[PDB]
Write a protein that binds this DNA or RNA. Sequence first.
DNA 1: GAAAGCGACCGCCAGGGGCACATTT
DNA 2: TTGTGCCCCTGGCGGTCGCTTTCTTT
Lengths: 325, 313, 322, 323, 92, 92
Amino acid sequence: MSTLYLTQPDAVLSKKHEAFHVALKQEDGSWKKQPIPAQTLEDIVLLGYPSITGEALGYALELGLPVHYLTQFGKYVGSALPSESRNGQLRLAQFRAHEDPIQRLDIVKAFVKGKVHNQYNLLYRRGQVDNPLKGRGKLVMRQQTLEQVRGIEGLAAREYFASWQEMLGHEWTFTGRFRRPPTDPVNALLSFGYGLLRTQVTAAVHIAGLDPYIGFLHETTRGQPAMILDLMEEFRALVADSVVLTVLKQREIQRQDFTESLGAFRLTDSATKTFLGAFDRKLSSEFKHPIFNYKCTYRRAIELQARLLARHLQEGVVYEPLVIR
Amino acid sequence: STLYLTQPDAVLSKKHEAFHVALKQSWKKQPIPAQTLEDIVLLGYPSITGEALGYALELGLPVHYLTQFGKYVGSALPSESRNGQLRLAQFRAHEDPIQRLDIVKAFVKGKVHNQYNLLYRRGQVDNPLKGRGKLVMRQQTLEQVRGIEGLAAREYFASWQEMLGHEWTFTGRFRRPPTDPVNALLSFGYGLLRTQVTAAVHIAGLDPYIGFLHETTRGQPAMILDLMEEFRALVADSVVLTVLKQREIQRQDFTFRLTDSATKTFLGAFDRKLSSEFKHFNYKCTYRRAIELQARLLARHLQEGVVYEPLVI
Amino acid sequence: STLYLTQPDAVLSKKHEAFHVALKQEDGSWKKQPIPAQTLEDIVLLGYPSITGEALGYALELGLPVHYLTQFGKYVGSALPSESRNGQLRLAQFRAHEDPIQRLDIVKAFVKGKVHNQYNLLYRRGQVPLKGRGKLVMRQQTLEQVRGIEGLAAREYFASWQEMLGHEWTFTGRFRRPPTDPVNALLSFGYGLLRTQVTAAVHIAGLDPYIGFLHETTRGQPAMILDLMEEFRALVADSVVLTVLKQREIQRQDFTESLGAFRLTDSATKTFLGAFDRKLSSEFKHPIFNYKCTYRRAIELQARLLARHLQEGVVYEPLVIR
Amino acid sequence: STLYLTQPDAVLSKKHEAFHVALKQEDGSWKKQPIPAQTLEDIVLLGYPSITGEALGYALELGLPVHYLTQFGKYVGSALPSESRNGQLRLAQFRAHEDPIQRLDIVKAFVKGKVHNQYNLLYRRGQVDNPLKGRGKLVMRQQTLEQVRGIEGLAAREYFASWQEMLGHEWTFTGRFRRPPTDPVNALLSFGYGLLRTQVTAAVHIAGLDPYIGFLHETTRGQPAMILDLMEEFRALVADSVVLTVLKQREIQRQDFTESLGAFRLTDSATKTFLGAFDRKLSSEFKHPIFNYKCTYRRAIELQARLLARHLQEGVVYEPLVI
Amino acid sequence: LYLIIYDVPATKAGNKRRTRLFDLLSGYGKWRQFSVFECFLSVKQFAKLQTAMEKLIKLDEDAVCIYVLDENTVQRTITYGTPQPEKPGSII
Amino acid sequence: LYLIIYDVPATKAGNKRRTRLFDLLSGYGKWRQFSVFECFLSVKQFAKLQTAMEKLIKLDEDAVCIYVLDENTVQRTITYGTPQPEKPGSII
DNA sequence: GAAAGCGACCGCCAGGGGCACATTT
DNA sequence: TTGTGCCCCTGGCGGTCGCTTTCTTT
């Protein structure tokens, strides 16, 4: 629904009585203060830390326009979210069922039961003969402790990442994924994708009133949110992952990268503006919703899963996550 | 250890690995180093260089936008920050009557001792309560306590007849509808404090719509209405009596609305009061800041177990 | 679509592809107004207003006839667009007029199409004379009898009207040119500007107005219209006055000046024409289809049906209503 | 008996009961000429004058047509009244189309007129005075249609083949080729016959005839046969003559366009100066036979159409206008 | 209705075309606003206008726009100051 | 998809209404012609905008119409010197 | 008299230049 | 180096009032 993106790190977003005015030119004229409609937006994403007005944040939040903050590369740094919800009873459930392990299990065993099948039902489409995650899926439910499941999610992540070189091609090398900064060239791009997936997932939690910091998979003992990731996890294979090989196949094969100050293979300006296009294109894909015939864009799918989990925490709904073959 | 900006005539920047607060309309640069800070508070409506809004977010520091009066508009939060244990302890406490009750006693002690010290300020006759503060501590459940604040409220309000005179009537406290001029001035002030408290809450990370004393319903910002008690007698109930001696007379009140001219002189007393305090450990303070403090001390009462003794005079 | 115009001091000038009509209300008195061509289907001039000669050269190239009329609504004449080129048609229209064995078999239908509509209008408005007369036409053997029959049914139609009009007016005897009564003059109104929509339809079907079938053409009046106007004389010319007299223009109007004349006032023309377009802008469902053949179309449709009747030997089923 | 107005600047108006013309300018204080009713049963606004509606309203209440034309005579419209005796006129126009005696005795008139104007023309352009010598009465002594059309189509050939002698060298001629003209001369002729067509058409519309019902030219293909029947006795004198006149001081090869698709078109200049003669030629005719003096070709067309209206309505004679 | 919009420059070679197009649209429809005409017409009468347009406009410096509202999507239109859409028989 | 026009006099107390109506519609939609905006948007945006538009006009002196054009009717807006309507998200 | 062809006084359209402002159950 | 109005006056639109040349065409 008409998301906004800014990438010139010298601009200004001023306000005119109902709307925004962006300014770029930077003294080759009169700054080229071009108009922009604000009441039709749903979100704002910033990459270069552009100077925004102070009087405009308030208006963006009087409407429901969350502000985000990323870096040139695309790494996540923070966000300014709007008025929060009121169903604190929900959040109390989010927790009341967070410290009873016998429930936290039955929930994460769905989060992953709908995360490995979502990987295999992407590979089989890509053309992987076996790449056997179908087994890990069946071996989830057997498990009966969270420490017996986090290991499986990591193992499956590595089984899903070790099956990359044969999928990508001979051009780029993806031997493994590193926790340290983007040493691997292809891995500098998922931090973009997996970075600006939180842009659309750190607000769907704020729409259902879910407390971001209390989750079911990630131990909330490091200042890291738990719902923002735990929930962002299912959608790391299908909205922030299929984007990558969708664009790394038709587009940006190479010649649009750089390297400096650590090696640190980076991306390039004038290629981002194509990446973000790919992202808004993937978000606005319809996909017909394999539960009923919803036929809803992913952009909603997230905002839905949030409320479905909330109702699960209030109305005892069944948590049927997403899977597409 | 927080960086405030009370003037929209300022500019923030990142100049060579450290903050630079260009203030005085160009006039009064004064660089500041990082790694001592834990929070920033842009009180007015400044302009701020995005180059700084990264060096503060990739570091572990939020940025809270407000307005010169203290109303809460928005906050920029980082990805990595330790507010999880805080929320968790807060909930563990809401469902643990030990912590909840020993904290509710703090709020009630604060309220009643502030009321008594107000009637000492105005020196009513020195017969308002005389010992309500400790009686609460001598309780061991909630109902007992919750039944003491209302008794103290009637004792504290009915004593205003001799305090004010005949120029302004008063018998009790009536919320919406105000039903009288002074009850309406109260509602307005009692509420205007809600904004400073809402900010002070989001600054510390607490969840306003989940609290300890005021049970949560209709999205009642219980975490606000709790922190509001200890001030209901020290800011608003003092401001009203500070202007009801000189300026505001029955003229200014319709019928029970208020005229636009009073909605601006009331603030000449409100903000003015909010720019002064002594302490008590002597500490420079302005009533506005003490609210952020009490919130941080509550967060530390839940995280570190620090004692939370409320504010008194 | 159709455009009626009243004020006789209105110069109707022609601008690039429209007409500007000039009205005069007292401030300096040249107040003008644009008016679009390309959307009209015919013009009607009630008074005797002005026409810029170079404007006929525009209205006669889009199919817009210029029908001249009088304050009272008494038809006088018209100007028409490019003529028709179906001479082969106007030959049959004539050889069937001099073959009386054919002319009689046509007038029988022209009347069967009127008497049925009369009796059905009566049952439509509440009544029940004309039941056993539509059948005493096809059993004739000549024409003079048929003309006497039409006169009979008409002197019964105009004197059987009283039972439905009301006490407000009275109808006893009828004269054609002199407007003795108001209604007897509202007929001169309707009977005049029904030819406006007929005389153009015939022009479209390449028919000749002068060559007659029922009316004998040796009077100087077009004997094709005054035979075709008969079928709708009782539908649009009549049913409009009887539905504009239902709480409209009952009295308080119709100045009685010039004894022997019942002229309308203003504000009654501008309403009578609105009700007229109500009639010629509605649908009656026409047995052929569930919904078809707008009223104004029906006339052009009848004209082309008669053309086919004279070249393709088709039936000529007049328009019967229930 | 006909209120003509060839000037475009005139205005008619009713002065207390009767028409009143104001020629050549302003309604106020310039060039009045009053004229009554009681001889007026036809009003002809040749150009594009203005007229006050109060005049027509009068006219249309007594059977007075208003024929709007162009300053050249082209027909653009007619305002006809309700009461008009054009019924018997049409009935006779048809009763003659379906009675070969009338049709034939009228076709003989047209043929006689055309060939007579042709003979009197070839002596008018004194050539040798031996073109045909006597094809006129050869028609009248026949009693058929086919034997008259043969005479028409043979006199046409024996008449057009007598031209190259009379034009000379710079222009070639072999015969009459209708549209598309294979020659320049056929182009001028097919273009002049159309102007004569406009004038006739106007006459046929005033007279009240049905232009699409004819006597000689069979009515089919939507042909204005009643116009051609009246053209036949004017082509030789107004069109076939104007062409001869301009090709001896005026237009020469320089003008007519090249063979685009073979048809020889005219220039943007001659099409305006050609009327230099095609407007004076129809402003003439001092009536050779001492019958009368005052007349014009442009008006003789209206006349002949009315004389036919009378030949049918009133059993009058119809003599073609010769020389 | 068929809503027509023209916004042509203020140059004395375009003002000719703007006023000429105004005089045209005043022949097919009703003037609604300074640069908005409401033409209610069929296709026989719309081609006669589009052919009169393509022969008139310089689309390298002109600015035109058209909207095709059919009857049952005009009932929905809202107005505040000007009258309602109507295309009946006209009288004066 | 919605479409908005306005016609306002040049009174100093009315020109403010225009220069505020543009500064309003900018936040609520796009721009094609001088007195015209084309605003593709939802309904509650309308209940927030209409309630602002009724809220700043006197009817004795201003003119505005509101044309509603949902997808099927928008498709054909044949033009010659302008791009036709649409409304995506934007990258800068 | 009538059409179309120009060449200027005033009701609609916007960006640009300064200089009063700023608190809120 | 942060909005919200309230002036002038420079400026690309929008249409009417008032003025010299046209008129004739298979």
